[PDB]
Design a protein around this nucleic acid. Structure first.
Ligand SMILES: Nc1ncnc2c1ncn2[C@H]1C[C@H](O)[C@@H](COP(=O)(O)OP(=O)(O)OP(=O)(O)O)O1
Ligand SMILES: [Mg+2]
Length: 418
DNA sequence: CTCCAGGCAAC
RNA sequence: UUUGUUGCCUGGAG
């Protein structure tokens, strides 16, 4: 059966290689991903037989406080490298059980389904005429999943009694705070390999309820949004779905994140819209500011690495960042930020030549006319003031940086579009 | 299509 | 320090 299908050698080996490639910090027994192969070889005959007998209880998850981009504290649950391996072996077998019957409008944590599909369908509804959105998010979503309602939904397709006892055992296994087990009443661990799938199993009935209601929607994780023709119809369905998820699935709504507002005034998965009739996708103001804050720390303030290294470090971030944010339809702001990136990268190049004699030595070697070299080498202006001056743009502008190995932001934006 | 070193994003 | 999933991307062994 399913526990036998989970404990199959090929399914365990692929699950092992995942946590190995993850390189995640150890659980509460302190054993690392590096020791994971050596640890299971010694403890396998026990682990295998003790969970075959239904006597196996997993070790508690490690509490780690990480800050969220919103500001608040996110509590993580880090399982034992074995407890991460076992959950993986459960996930790998539970995906073909649950995934095909998941919603067409479900996009979160799913194989072959991305954030772009969630936005393309989202712009496709407002383009059709549904020019109002009911954006919704859930209060501490992974912390608030009810154990009884969840395994009710797990038992719907899974008939094997041994795995239902095993998943419950993982859910019931507590946390370690000051060397003591702290039993869990509600919540699936924020860091359990299986836990993102269990999140989709619970809210599949919410998907089924919305599909029965005949509503045009997009869901990614707990961040769900329904696309309506009007503000009156949106406000109406804002309360009736809140009542549904609070009663039938027992979940609390984050009212600070949830709104009935216009799609272009709100952000969805790092993207926003334009007030146009056929609405174009734009960068959300949070996503622009997260980029700008990252470039400020990547470019040298009082930092000390090699500049050819720095250019490559800027390269790997920007080219990756544009890989996700290729979906935006406004290249104008993308043209500005690349110019801003060049402008910011000019600042740390200007301070590198600290001496006035080195300033003249390099600018004359670059090709710039002596008339302009001596005019700006001994200037009294500030460091950020000098980076916008006509002469520093001539010696060190667009043509210089591209020759120095800086990969252009806009060039690869159109390359990924083509 | 599977796996390895790394990176970007969403959650 | 910092976990997990999912998508994509650069390079590599098949
Ligand atoms: N880095 C992560 N690692 C593991 N799980 C994560 C991570 N980020 C998000 N999740 C999971 C747990 C969250 O409950 C769920 C939905 O994300 P999100 O709404 O941002 O957080 P949240 O619901 O815990 O907080 P909030 O109460 O502030 O809305 O996705
Ligand atoms: Mg939430």
């Amino acid at each position: 059966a399913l526990l036998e299908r989970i404990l199959a050698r090929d399914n365990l080996i692929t699950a092992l290689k995942r946590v190995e490639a993850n390189q995640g910090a150890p659980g509460i027994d302190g054993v690392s991903t590096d020791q994971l192969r050596d640890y299971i070889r010694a403890h396998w005959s026990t682990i295998h037989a003790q969970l075959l007998a239904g006597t196996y209880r997993p070790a508690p998850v490690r509490r780690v406080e990480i800050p969220k981009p919103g500001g608040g504290t996110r509590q993580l649950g880090i399982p034992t490298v074995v407890d991460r391996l076992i959950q993986q072996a459960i996930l790998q077998e539970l995906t073909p059980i649950f995934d095909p019957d998941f919603s067409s409008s479900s996009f979160g944590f799913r194989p072959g389904r991305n954030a772009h599909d969630a936005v393309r369908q989202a712009q496709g509804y407002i383009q059709e005429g549904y020019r109002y959105v009911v954006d919704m998010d859930l209060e501490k979503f992974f912390d608030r999943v009810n154990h009884d309602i969840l395994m009710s939904r797990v038992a719907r397709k899974v008939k094997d009694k041994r795995v239902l006892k095993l998943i419950r055992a993982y859910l019931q296994a507590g946390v370690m705070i000051e060397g003591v087990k702290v039993q869990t009443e509600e919540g699936t661990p924020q860091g359990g390999p299986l836990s993102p799938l269990l999140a989709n199993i619970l809210l599949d009935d919410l998907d089924k309820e919305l599909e029965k209601r005949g509503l045009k929607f997009c869901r990614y994780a707990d961040d769900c949004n329904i696309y309506v023709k009007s503000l009156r119809a949106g406000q109406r369905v804002k309360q009736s779905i809140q009542r549904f998820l609070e009663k039938t699935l027992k979940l609390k709504v984050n009212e600070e994140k949830s709104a009935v507002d216009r799609p272009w005034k709100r952000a969805f998965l790092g993207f926003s819209f334009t007030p146009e009739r056929k609405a174009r996708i734009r960068l959300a103001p949070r996503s622009i500011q997260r980029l700008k804050q990252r470039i400020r720390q990547l470019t040298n303030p009082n930092w000390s690495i090699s500049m050819p290294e720095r250019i490559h470090r800027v390269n790997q971030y920007v080219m990756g960042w544009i890989g996700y944010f290729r979906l935006v339809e406004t290249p104008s702001v993308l043209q500005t930020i690349e110019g801003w990136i060049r402008r910011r990268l000019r600042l740390c190049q200007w301070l590198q030549w600290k001496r006035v004699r080195t300033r003249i030595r390099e600018l004359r070697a670059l090709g710039l006319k002596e008339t302009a070299v001596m005019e700006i080498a001994n200037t009294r202006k500030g460091a950020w003031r000098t980076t916008k001056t006509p002469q520093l743009h001539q010696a060190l502008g667009k043509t210089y940086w591209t020759a120095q190995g800086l990969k252009s932001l806009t060039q690869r934006y159109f390359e990924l579009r083509q």
